[PDB]
Design a binder for this molecule. Structure first.
Ligand SMILES: [Mg+2]
Ligand SMILES: [Zn+2]
Ligand SMILES: [Zn+2]
Ligand SMILES: [Zn+2]
Lengths: 98, 39, 98, 521, 528, 66, 255, 115, 44, 34
RNA sequence: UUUGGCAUAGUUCC
């Protein structure tokens, strides 16, 4: 035993998974409740989807007044193993050299 | 094609040496004002 | 305790390092109306700073057709940074390309 | 693509993109891509056929469903960056047909273009006749309407809960509300709304409400609040006594039972004691919990249990019926929000030839600048539906619902086609010269009431560090007199009023100072 | 740290010395009340019974103050404290002994706020000095801050969930300051632009035009009522204009009684043509424009936003400059009450019948739209055949876009003009636009004829996808529909692409609204 | 929740018509014909039966406390 | 300078409806009678509820509010009763109120409908109008119970709308627009009134400059409490007593 | 919280007088009547009856605030006639009309049923 | 003091300083019983 | 076998089948299950 | 007849 993992309601590992509306009413649970939230210390928590830039793709942008003219980054991750991201940049210096 | 409104008011109140869209309206003296040649 | 704390407070990270931890995940479920509950359970988030004056990520891009609601958005310091899924939109769960 | 459509080797979730110009093929098995289903058009004809439609409409006792539709290669999931190599058609039977050739190489088709709207924007009727800010405002205000929020609210001890007495499903409803279950747990009431300027109390986004209608249960609701307390010295649930406990207040302890908890059904006014708890000071200190000031509710339910550790735990719920006053906030489904201005009885409200006084009167000036014509069309369709007996269909993009068709349908029931109706003045009985536009619109009662917003202060509690008034309506705090306000008073020149606001009304003080060194002595 | 304590906002200096929380303040919802005066505010009985004012005992009021103390803190017209000369406080919220109730001159009694008290009323943010004005208290049953409707413009306050703050001065010195300096009638004309800052607002304004038309003939009983609602009325009913075969008054004949003193003014209605002033009928005005007020009598003309509004030289401005605040206050109140009680006879509304056009107008609009789309197609063909020549100072893309936008704007404006000139004399949109109450000809045009082009960042709708706006269009399509020109009106409804483009257009407005506010506040603070 | 006793707009009693209305609908009637038969003449009264959602049936599913 | 000479004609008279025409009367008088129908006609209704046991799915204020709106037959004893504020009793006596009792328990496997049939009164002349279907009060599961005592006072519709004795009062004068009290932008779109006396081609009657509104048409529909003839008579007597008391007070003040 | 009880709109409390008579000093033979706890139901009848009188030059009424129950009636009459007499005659004529109307309605009911 | 169990609906006496357990069903959530005090509702 | 001008019911039958199969919060449930 | 604070989230109004 290494610890306790919170369970999302109505998910495959909840006690309400697959039950009929009559059983839900017996357990004093609303059959219309959509589920998909955790119960942490009584209160009900909802995770909010977080946007992020797509990984493992080469994007070429430009910066307004930086040293380089064009940049290119490849936010790299390995199959959700570890080492979250490693953004390697391959830039190109501007033509305004002194 | 210039800046007006809140950004222009910000620039005029806190004067910068590098305005966003500097301009210089120029008036001509003589026949350059009328005839398109010297214009 | 780690899972319980991160879900309870919303600071996604360890307790000792709740300074750079991104707050705003794991909100407490809205229960004012059924529509409020559903629109809370289907919600997105752009981590862009809510005080940022540059409002290009706050606009409605052409690529949100059928993926994100064109109307439903909060007004104020988070206009265009909190969004809601369209009705038939789905989000991929993931596999491996073997 | 053939393998993905057969669902043999490649799951339906995987996307494939070909960049024809740049000669690259990109295949994604990633997690987090967002995609929506689309119909497939092979040559110019949908692969979806009447056999599929019949097998779907016999869905019960037939085990044929969406998965069996997908496995047949009829529909497909398209993510965002695969949509850049596809040609879509908005409507099959309109865009596949022979025309002046725009595109003859369609690759997909939309199921219905109204599925681009979210949960909260699928309840607006005729959103394509509205203005985009108005649709956004309604999307915001749909999460604040009061209706039955869940069917098992009787066993939930939620900190604040609001449930309407008599919710009604809309008489003008969108086709995509059956999936949002707005028919089963609605939030609002169909009200006979007349758009007229009656007595000037609805000017600037205000609402005149029929008081006789309100007396019959119109837009009435309940308010539930829950309190909790655990006995974490030795805190004990017990009934305190005035001449044995150190801490004490000017409240009443005679409501409590022997163990210090109020039994349900006991009316408790503001500033009473619900749970009595005492700390044994090393001879007893009172830490009882008090009602939030001026509630005047009835105890509804008391629950006694044990917490995680083993200390005794208690949650007490109080209910209070909220009758719509002249400060409450109401809104329709078109971004038109307003507060009650005044309430007239039935004898005073203007009446039609048939004795139908409006439930709500709204100002005609709200319409021309806001351009919420969905409001007027919903009113007309509701007036048709309440007479015909059907429930109107207001799904956004229809082409089979016109204002002309609605007006023709309404003219067949004895009413003016465009919705107007001759009203009589209430006080004098004389006809009003201009005919009024009246019909049943679906209104909502927002969460914002006036009994939860009224606040006043005159020499109350005071902060500790600054010795200034507290902050917060719940703590009887004052109102901040900010820098903008003091600049306004400077511009006025009311020097004595400004000094009073910034010094005398707030913290006054006295010190002594040495005449040689400017240091307090 | 201490530097953090003193650093910024919520820091000691700028958060507790330049601005701090005060006593004797209240905040609740505001609702309209057209039966109040300009300088009056309705206060609930709870707030008044909660807020107190200290009155010094003198032989002129010792009996009244003693009766207030006898009533005590329970009954509303009571008192809460008795302050001795030595300064020691006496409570009155509970039951006291009969000895302390003794009152002698030099004492102070903290009575509850009553009618006629002077308070300062504010709505945040406070932009100009017309956001903090002094009002006179009137106690009303329910629990909102009733305030008049002409005072909406100074505060920028509408009655949809709004709240405002109440501050009660506590001394005779500051009460006299506020009475002589910051009372509402004294702030009618602003020093920012030397114009009246408040005027008739949209409902008396949509009805004074109808009242002042030529057709309005009033019966004897209606005249009796309207005069019953006049506060500055002598008591003599004027001779009717039409004397036979039935006595009939006129709307101008009663607005003349409303207008104070001997005011001389000449304005112009908002539909006055450009030929009446030049050709004949200069002083006869067939359409009843050219307002003329001589000796305080409305001789001719129709009153609208340009006469009773908040513009320079208007009738209200002349009334102020000639008569004073004390008479302009009555001017406002009388206009509002008389016009509202007459409007109870005429009525007003807005509906689909008022938003629907005629078949000939629909044919005209559709013809114009088809011609504009054909012209855009021709321009695109010329550009593709490279026959388009650039304009000096512009790129090829710039000149093509300028021509396309110009054609589409001409189409939208022509359809708008057709929709305007196809209206009727009973149309309620026209009623609310001509009188200047609320709306505009562009709004009427968008309702009837054409919503128009949608722009993002000043340019047409951009190419979000690879070289196309949406997946429903071919690549490289510069037609009016591809880049977001809504051909339909709000009454006909928008096709799905136009719906999405309209949402994209409205998002920019929402963003600008949410963005400009902080910068404007910061600029104003720096200037101050 | 449960059908109101009176019609909000005019005050005609509609609280004794829900069972009859449901029976008429079950007996193969259109909603218009059922409302005509029950005597609901004006649309203010008709909407009370047309738009009603009966949640007390759902509330009766859960067992009582005692 | 004298009074009018009104005349009446009853077009239709049933158990829930009276249609009549008042003639030779002023619009102010006709409208005052119309207003008195709604507001100031005394009615008996429940105004005091004490719930002994309520284990149902509706809270006590919900049930009490529903009880208040059940109409009680006050045809003959509404005149005999006194106002509770006008009575010599302490709280309630048979001379100023009628007591009701409800006591229902469900012990079966089928949902039970608690209706107005179960309200029991001590006086046999004040009973719910559905006691010579039934007004539903609440539905009970198995094991749920309701029991209460209620008192029916006397009052009129100005105080609360549960004492309003009418359902819809249709009032209309000048069905053809001969007086031009309302102005039609297009007269031919408007349906003709029920009492119109025009042909199928003409839409508005020709203008009558020397005319005043006369011949008001009424239709008083009763909600079951009073019968629709006593609603009209009590309004004429009820308005007449208001004017008489005004004359008494004026006479004292003048002298 | 600040809700007045419903009975305050028609019940005179301790001290309130039903009707008070005041003179108008602007114009001769004018008088103002203030009636407490009344509304349009009485104001309109009294005004419309006063206008029928040929010796009444002015006759109006108004409700100063809809939230405060009070009626003000102003009547001015020709000399050799007083507004108090005009008021009393108006009330008497109204009572006579209502009595006649009730009699005729009762006889019409009798004719309609069993006749 | 009588508390009604939330599962078996059986009321049982529980005094102060006593773990909140239910006999014959072993539950841990107890509800207070409705008071015998009488409260008057207007029927408005 | 085409479905012409009967489309306004076929499309909604398809959409109803979609929402019967999946629901509205399928994303959260599927993500947590995976 | 006595006074907890820090942080985060959501909402109302310009
Ligand atoms: Mg506002
Ligand atoms: Zn009705
Ligand atoms: Zn008695
Ligand atoms: Zn048990």
């Amino acid at each position: 035993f290494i610890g306790k993992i919170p369970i999302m309601l109505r998910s495959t590992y909840c006690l309400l998974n697959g039950l009929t509306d009559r059983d839900l009413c017996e357990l004093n649970e609303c059959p219309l409740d959509p589920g998909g939230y955790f119960i942490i210390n009584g209160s009900e928590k909802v995770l909010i989807a977080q946007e992020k830039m797509a990984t493992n793709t080469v994007y070429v942008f430009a910066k307004k007044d930086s040293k380089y003219a064009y940049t290119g980054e490849c936010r790299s991750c390995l199959e959700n193993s570890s080492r979250p991201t490693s953004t390697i940049w391959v830039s190109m210096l501007a033509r305004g050299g002194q | 094609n210039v800046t007006l409104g809140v950004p222009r008011l910000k620039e005029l109140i806190n004067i910068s040496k590098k305005p966003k869209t500097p301009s210089l309206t120029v008036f001509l003296l003589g026949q350059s004002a009328r005839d398109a040649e010297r214009a | 305790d780690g899972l319980k704390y991160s879900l309870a407070t919303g600071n996604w990270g360890d307790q000792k390092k709740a300074h750079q931890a991104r707050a705003g995940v794991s909100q407490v479920l809205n229960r004012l109306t059924f529509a409020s509950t559903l629109s809370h359970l289907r919600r997105l988030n752009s981590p862009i700073g809510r005080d940022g004056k540059l409002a290009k990520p706050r606009q409605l891009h052409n690529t949100l057709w059928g993926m994100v609601c064109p109307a439903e958005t909060p007004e104020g310091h988070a206009v265009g940074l909190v969004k809601n899924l369209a009705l038939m939109a789905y989000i991929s769960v993931g596999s491996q390309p073997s | 693509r053939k393998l993905r459509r057969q669902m043999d080797i490649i799951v339906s979730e995987v996307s494939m993109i070909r960049d024809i110009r740049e000669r690259e093929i990109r295949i994604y098995t990633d997690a987090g891509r967002i995609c929506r289903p689309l119909l497939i058009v092979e040559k110019q004809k949908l692969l979806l056929k009447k056999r599929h439609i019949d097998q779907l409409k016999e869905r019960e006792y037939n085990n044929y469903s969406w998965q069996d539709l997908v496995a047949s290669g009829v529909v497909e999931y398209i993510d965002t960056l695969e949509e850049e190599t596809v040609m879509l058609a908005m409507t099959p039977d309109d865009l596949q047909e022979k025309e002046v050739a725009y595109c003859s190489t369609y690759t997909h088709c939309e199921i219905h273009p109204s599925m681009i709207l979210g949960v909260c924007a699928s309840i607006i009727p005729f959103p394509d006749h509205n203005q985009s800010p108005r649709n956004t405002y309604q999307s915001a205000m749909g999460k604040q309407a009061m209706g039955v929020y869940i069917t098992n609210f009787h066993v939930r001890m939620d900190t604040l809960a609001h449930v309407l007495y008599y919710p009604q499903k809309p008489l003008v409803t969108t086709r995509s509300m059956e999936y949002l279950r707005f028919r089963e747990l609605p939030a609002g009431i169909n009200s006979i709304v007349a758009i007229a300027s009656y007595t000037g109390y609805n000017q600037e986004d205000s609402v005149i409400m029929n008081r006789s209608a309100v007396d019959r249960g119109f837009f009435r609701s309940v308010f539930y609040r829950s309190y909790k307390e655990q006995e974490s010295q030795e805190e004990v649930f017990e009934k305190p006594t005035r001449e044995t406990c150190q801490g004490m207040r000017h409240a009443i302890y005679d409501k409590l039972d022997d163990d210090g908890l109020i039994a349900p059904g006991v009316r408790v006014s503001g500033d009473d004691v619900i749970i009595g708890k005492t700390v044994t000071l090393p001879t007893k200190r009172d830490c009882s919990t008090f009602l939030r000031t001026s509630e005047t509710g009835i105890v509804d339910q008391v629950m006694v249990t044990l917490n995680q550790e083993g200390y005794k735990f208690c949650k007490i719920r109080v209910r209070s019926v909220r009758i719509p006053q002249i400060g409450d906030k109401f809104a329709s489904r078109h971004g038109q929000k307003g507060t009650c201005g005044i309430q007239y009885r039935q004898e005073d409200m203007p009446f039609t030839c048939e004795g139908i006084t409006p439930d709500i009167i709204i100002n005609p000036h709200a319409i021309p600048s806001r351009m919420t014509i969905g409001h007027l069309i919903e009113c007309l369709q509701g007036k048709v539906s309440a007479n015909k007996g059907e429930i109107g269909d207001a799904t956004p993009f229809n082409d089979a619902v016109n204002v002309q068709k609605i007006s023709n349908l309404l003219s067949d029931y004895g009413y003016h086609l465009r919705g107007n109706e001759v009203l009589y003045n209430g006080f004098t009985g004389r006809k009003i010269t201009s005919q009024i536009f009246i019909g049943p619109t679906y209104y909502q009662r927002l969460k914002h009431m006036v009994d939860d917003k009224i606040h006043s202060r005159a020499r109350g509690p005071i902060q500790i560090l600054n010795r200034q008034p507290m902050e917060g309506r719940s703590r009887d705090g004052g109102l901040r007199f900010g820098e903008m306000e003091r600049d306004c008073q400077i511009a006025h020149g009311a020097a004595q009023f400004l000094r009073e606001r910034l010094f005398e009304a707030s913290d006054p003080y006295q010190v002594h100072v040495c005449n040689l060194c400017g240091i307090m002595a | 740290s201490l530097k953090q304590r003193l650093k910024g906002k919520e820091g000691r200096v700028r958060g507790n010395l330049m601005g701090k929380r005060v006593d004797f303040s209240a905040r609740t919802v505001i609702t309209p009340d057209p039966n109040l005066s300009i300088d009056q505010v309705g206060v609930p009985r709870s707030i008044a019974a909660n807020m107190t004012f200290a009155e010094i005992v003198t032989p002129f009021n010792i009996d009244r103050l003693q009766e207030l103390v006898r009533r005590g803190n329970s009954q509303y017209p009571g008192a809460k404290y008795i302050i001795r000369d030595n300064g020691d406080r006496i409570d009155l919220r509970f039951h006291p002994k009969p000895s302390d109730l003794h009152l002698q001159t030099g004492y102070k009694v903290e009575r509850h706020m009553c009618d006629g008290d002077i308070v300062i009323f504010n709505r945040q943010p406070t932009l100009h000095k017309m956001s903090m004005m002094g009002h006179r208290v009137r106690i009303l049953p329910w629990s909102t801050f009733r305030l008049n409707l002409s005072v909406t413009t100074p505060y920028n306050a509408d009655f949809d969930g709004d709240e405002m703050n109440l501050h009660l001065p506590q001394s005779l010195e500051t009460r006299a300051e506020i009475q002589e300096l910051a009372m509402v009638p004294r702030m009618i004309v602003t020093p920012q632009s030397n114009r009246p800052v408040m005027g008739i607002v949209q409902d008396t304004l949509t009805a004074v035009r109808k009242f002042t038309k030529r057709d309005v003939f009033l019966e004897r009983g209606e005249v009796m009522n309207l005069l019953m609602f006049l506060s500055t009325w002598d008591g003599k009913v004027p001779q009717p204009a039409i004397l036979k075969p039935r006595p009939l008054w006129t709307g101008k004949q009663i607005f003349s009684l409303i207008i104070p003193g001997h005011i001389n003014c000449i304005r112009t209605h908002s539909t006055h043509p450009d030929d009446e002033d030049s050709g004949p009928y200069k002083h006869i005005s067939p359409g009843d424009t050219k307002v003329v007020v001589e000796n305080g009598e409305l001789i001719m003309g129709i009153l609208c936003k340009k006469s009773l509004g908040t513009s320079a030289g208007s009738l209200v401005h002349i009334s102020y400059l000639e008569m004073g605040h004390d008479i302009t206050r009555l001017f406002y109140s009388n206009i509002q009450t008389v016009i509202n009680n007459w409007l109870l006879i005429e009525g007003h509304t807005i509906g689909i019948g008022d938003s629907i056009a005629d078949s000939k107008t629909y044919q005209d609009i559709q013809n114009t739209i088809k011609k504009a789309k054909q012209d855009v197609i021709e321009v695109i063909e010329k550009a593709h055949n490279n026959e388009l020549e650039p304009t000096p100072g512009n790129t090829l893309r710039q000149t093509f876009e300028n021509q396309v936008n110009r054609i589409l704007n001409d189409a939208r404006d022509k359809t708008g003009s057709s929709a305007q000139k196809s209206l009727s004399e009973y149309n309620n949109f026209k009623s609310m636009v001509v009188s200047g109450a609320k709306g505009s000809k562009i709004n009427i045009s968008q309702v009837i004829a054409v919503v128009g082009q949608q722009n993002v960042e000043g340019k047409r709708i951009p190419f979000g996808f690879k070289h196309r706006t949406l997946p429903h269009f071919i690549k490289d399509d510069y037609g009016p529909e591809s880049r977001g020109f809504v051909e339909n009106s709000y009454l006909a409804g928008l096709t799905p692409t136009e719906f999405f483009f309209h949402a994209m257009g409205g998002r920019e407005g929402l963003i600008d609204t949410a963005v400009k506010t902080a910068e404007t506040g910061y600029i104003q603070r720096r200037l101050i | 929740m449960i059908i109101p006793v009176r019609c909000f707009t005019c005050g005609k009693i509609v609280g004794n018509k829900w069972e009859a209305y449901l029976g008429l609908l079950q007996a193969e009637y259109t909603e218009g014909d059922a409302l005509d038969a029950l005597g609901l003449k004006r649309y203010c009264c008709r909407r009370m039966l047309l738009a009603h959602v009966d949640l007390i049936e759902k509330l009766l599913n859960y067992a009582p406390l005692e | 300078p004298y009074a009018n000479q009104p005349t009446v004609r009853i077009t239709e008279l049933t158990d829930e409806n009276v249609k009549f025409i008042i003639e030779n009367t002023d619009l102010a008088v006709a409208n005052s009678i119309r207003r008195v129908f709604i507001a100031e006609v005394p009615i008996i209704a429940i105004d005091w509820v004490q719930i002994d046991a309520n284990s149902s799915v509706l809270h006590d204020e919900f049930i009490a509010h529903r009880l208040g709106l059940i109409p009680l037959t006050s045809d003959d004893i509404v005149d005999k009763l006194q106002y509770s504020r006008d009575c010599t009793c302490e709280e309630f006596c048979p001379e100023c109120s009628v007591e009701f009792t409800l006591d229902v328990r469900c012990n079966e496997d089928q949902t039970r409908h608690v209706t107005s049939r179960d309200l029991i009164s001590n006086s046999p002349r004040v009973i719910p109008v559905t006691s010579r279907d039934d007004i539903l009060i609440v539905k009970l599961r198995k094991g749920q119970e309701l029991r209460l005592r209620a008192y029916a006072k006397k009052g009129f519709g100005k105080e609360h709308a549960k004492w309003n004795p009418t359902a819809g009062v249709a009032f209309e004068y000048d069905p053809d627009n001969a007086l031009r009290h309302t102005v039609y932008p297009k007269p031919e779109e408007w349906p003709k009134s029920e009492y119109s006396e025009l042909d199928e081609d003409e839409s508005q009657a020709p203008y009558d400059p020397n005319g005043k509104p006369e011949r008001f048409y009424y239709n008083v529909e009763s909600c079951g409490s009073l019968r629709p003839e006593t609603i009209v008579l009590s309004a004429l007597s009820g308005l007449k007593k208001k004017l008489s008391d005004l004359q008494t007070q004026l006479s004292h003040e003048i002298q | 919280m600040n809700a007045p009880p419903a009975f305050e709109s028609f019940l005179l409390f301790e001290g309130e007088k039903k009707i008070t008579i005041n003179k108008d000093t602007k114009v001769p033979n004018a008088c103002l009547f203030t009636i407490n706890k009344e509304d349009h139901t009485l104001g309109n009848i009294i005004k419309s009856q006063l206008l029928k009188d040929p010796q009444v030059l002015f006759a109006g009424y108004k409700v100063p605030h809809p939230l405060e129950h009070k009626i003000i009636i102003r009547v001015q009459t020709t000399p050799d006639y007083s507004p108090q007499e005009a008021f009393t005659n108006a009330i008497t004529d109204l009572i006579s009309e209502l009595s006649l109307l009730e009699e005729r309605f009762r006889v019409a009911i009798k004719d309609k049923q069993e006749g | 003091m009588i508390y009604i169990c939330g599962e078996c609906h059986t009321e049982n006496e529980i005094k102060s300083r006593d773990p909140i357990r239910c006999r014959e069903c072993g539950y841990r959530i107890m509800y207070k019983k409705r008071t015998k005090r009488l409260v008057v509702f207007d029927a408005r | 076998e085409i479905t012409p001008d009967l489309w306004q019911e076929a499309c909604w039958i398809v959409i109803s089948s979609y929402f019967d199969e999946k629901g509205l919060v399928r994303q959260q449930l599927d993500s947590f299950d995976e």
